[PDB]
């Protein structure tokens, strides 16, 4: 029951979205610093392999869409 | 009178809190290591600048309180 | 009154699982690069101390199990 629980539940999800967005921004800056460092060691791909291409996708729009849906279907 | 969708949602949110707090602590340890490495290069902030002071906030209290609130609706 | 929401909640959680799974992988790769760079300076543990022995755990199974339980505790 309690379909007004939705705002609370989605506020929790919105807080997680803020947290993961910050984690993403920060971890990418760490890679930026690492890339600089490995430039004279052969470059990041030389050290990590094709794994150097892995980047965290920004799921923000899909998450906000699902949050909106919960509110909409309460 | 069986609303427990929130019960399990709450538990799922708690697992995610544990997982994200771990990512934050680990990513920050990575920056610490990076700061050491960039010392003789002028420091991290002279390589990242308009981004270097960025650190993930700890949203634990905010998330925990929101979860306690949801739990508090029954 | 409506379990489209129980499906939507599970769906937002799955989005967050993919998002955090990507962050964990990327972050661990950043540490891999950092471990390589710190090798000549005594090793990561020499620089970070016992904190060097921590890694984010993979909560995939734990989270997927909770997500399923939600669909079943429908
Ligand atoms: Cl990182």
Curated annotation (Swiss-Prot), chains A, B, C:
Q: Which residues form a coiled coil?
A: 1-39, 59-74
PTM note says:
Palmitoylation is not required for its function.
The record's disulfide annotation reads 45-52
Q: How does it sit in the membrane?
A: Single-pass type I membrane protein
Outcome (variant: residue 7 to D): Reduced levels of expression of GP, GP1 and GP2. 20% loss of virus capability to enter into host cell
The protein's recorded glycosylation sites are: 7, 62
What's this protein's name? GP2
Whichever gene encodes this chain, its name is GP
């Amino acid at each position: 029951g309690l379909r007004q629980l939705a705002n609370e539940t989605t506020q929790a999800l919105q807080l997680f979205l803020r947290a993961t967005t910050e984690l993403r921004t920060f971890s990418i800056l760490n890679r930026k610093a690492i890339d600089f460092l490995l430039q004279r060691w052969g470059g990041t791909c030389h050290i990590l392999g094709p794994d150097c291409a892995i980047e965290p996708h920004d799921w923000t729009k899909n998450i906000t869409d699902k949050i909106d849906q919960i509110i909409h279907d309460f």
